[PDB]
Amino acid sequence: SLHGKLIQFHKFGNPKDVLQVEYKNIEPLKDNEVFVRMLVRPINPSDLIPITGAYAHRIPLPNIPGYEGVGIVENVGAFVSRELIGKRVLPLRGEGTWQEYVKTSADFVVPIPDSIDDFTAAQMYINPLTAWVTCTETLNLQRNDVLLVNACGSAIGHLFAQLSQILNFRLIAVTRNNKHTEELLRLGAAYVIDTSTAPLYETVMELTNGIGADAAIDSIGGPDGNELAFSLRPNGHFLTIGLLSGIQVNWAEIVTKAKVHANIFHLRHWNDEVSPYKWQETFRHLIRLVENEQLRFMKVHSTYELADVKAAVDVVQSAEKTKGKVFLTSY
């Protein structure tokens, strides 16, 4: 009987301690399911957070990590078109992707055109959808708005730089160092504030002629996030997308002292706030942007077979890690 390899953890903790390589028997498919043999998944920093137990109450154990990647449809359930078999797809919003075979509902299978290589496709979901949605919906940025983005040397940071050109707004990148400065400028960032060298609040004030920015996206929290919120104009919009520091911003002061609107963005929630139709249409749009070369993703850092996940994760978590995305491959 057909068996599939999978990466699983049975307890939360450091991924190096809890990740196991295992095998499972393959169950029959349910009526609306699509069964996909995986080719490539990225190791995103956001794939590791659930392993650590930060979301204990919503992640059942044991669990298969991985939110994204690309594969080939091998089989479909009774109610699904069998023309899908053989197609390259992202099997999203279903099972964990760090395994040999992934199932998800037909509703959330994203077709990938022959034009797009596996490694680009494997990066299409988490960072691009977050960047696109926050820009076009959550903040609904207008022509010439001034957007602040911290931790901007990240994958998503590089996308915000490109979206500023696509959507005609002004990005002020905020970074911890100068490691990504050249790349961010090339990609379209209007300015890069390197906070190891320049003061955040005062520089934004210079760049905006004392008005402050229109919107800000915080990935860090704590003192860094608070300073980012305070660099906005009154009635500007502050959005958090991450918590790298582990420390909540001072929500009360941001509202009463800085007079800004503040929200928290979760792709988890956005996914449930839109129809499957809209969700698919949004992917069709990102795919066009990639095809037209308006949007480009990170280059490949290194590649590892699924069995070597522990080594791969160590590279991702390493302080010396160089630029680019690490992938788990299954060719």
CA angle 325, 33, 29 (to 5 degrees): 115
Query: What is the residue-wise DSSP string for 112-150?
Result: --TTS-HHHHTTSSHHHHHHHHIIIIIS---TT-EEEES
Contact between 6 and 24 under an 8 Å Cβ cutoff? The reply is yes
How far apart (Å, rounded) are the C-alpha atoms in residues 306 and 100? 8
**170: Cβ contacts below 8 Å, ≥ 6 apart:** 144, 145, 146, 147, 164, 190
List, in sequence order, every beta strand (DSSP E) within 120-270: 146-149, 170-175, 191-194, 213-218, 232-240, 261-264
- R_g (Cα) of the chain, nearest Å: 20
Q: Is 252 left (phi over 0), alpha (psi -120 to 50) or beta?
A: alpha
- What are the distances in angstroms from CA 306 to CA 19, 114, 303? 11, 24, 10
Dihedral, 183, 146, 231, 271 alpha carbons, nearest 10: -80
Nearest Cα to Cα of residue 49 among 302, 298, 267: 267
CA 90/CA 259 separation, integer angstroms: 41
Tell me the Ramachandran region of residue 280: left when phi exceeds 0, alpha when psi lies from -120 to 50, beta otherwise. Answer: alpha
Among the listed residues 122, 168, 172, 164, the one whose alpha carbon sits nearest the alpha carbon of residue 300:
122
Decide: 168 and 251 in contact? Cβ < 8 Å. no
Q: Which fold has domain 139-264?
A: Rossmann fold (3.40.50)
In this structure, CATH architecture of domain 1-138+265-331: Alpha-Beta Complex (3.90)
Resolution of the PDB structure in angstroms: 1.8
Query: Which experimental technique did the depositors report for determining this structure?
Result: X-ray
Domain ranges of the chain: 1-138+265-331, 139-264
The answer to whether 180 and 143 have CB atoms below 8 angstroms apart is: no
Instruction: Give bridge partners of residue 24 from the DSSP assignment.
Output: 4
